[PDB]
A = this chain, B = another copy of it.
């Protein structure tokens, strides 16, 4: 029987540049809370990179490619920081960084809510052939109240904490296990919430 993609024994993941803590696991589908994934400074820098990229990509600017408004503008431009972090993430996720879509940065304001959703795409969808297989959500700041990552079919919540992350995979043969990774963010009620996400495809993506 094919084992989980995430393949780590023990209570830490030793990456080239950082020791990540394995905090807790829901065992099937695999959902893993991870500590110390990003430094505080790295969290702050990813937020700043997202803001500065946006401030200079408006209408009339030279590089306002149309697709960035619908809706790829949340992916960071490549630089030495994003390469460093994607390399670390690849050790955590056991999949080369070439399979990653790249660091996607998003913020949630008070009382905003998304529906719970799946991260993988629908069958016969455009991305079905080389679908997403696993996700890493990195919390880039502390949230005074609300903002939990909630898995409603499992009744499991992961609360945001700067530098912490939640990993989950949905590449199971039994499709019901993949559907149990349905998830959304509980509303922020005090503060704001910043996350970086790495979505990993079955095959190479970039």
Chain A residues with CB under 8 Å of chain B are 9-11, 21-28, 33, 35, 142-148, 155-161, 164, 190
Contact = CB atoms under 8 A, between A and B. Distances in A.
A159 B23 CA distance: 5
Contacts of A25: 148, 156-157, 159
A24 B147 contact: no
Given A9-B145, A11-B159, A161-B11, A23 B23 contact: yes
Contact of A158 (B24, B35, B146): B24
Contacts of A158: 23-24
Contact of A23 (B33, B142, B145, B190): B33
A161 B10 CA distance: 11
Contacts of A144: 10-11
Nearest to A21: B161
Contacts of A9: 145
A147 to B, nearest CB: 7
Nearest to A144: B10
A160 B24 contact: no
A180 to B, nearest CB: 11
B161 A27 contact: no
Contacts of A159: 11, 21-25
Given A10-B190, A24-B24, 20 more contacts: A9-B145, A10-B144, A10-B145, A10-B146, A11-B145, A11-B161, A22-B159, A23-B23, A23-B158, A23-B159, A23-B161, A23-B164, A24-B156, A24-B157, A24-B158, A25-B159, A27-B156, A27-B157, A28-B155, A33-B33
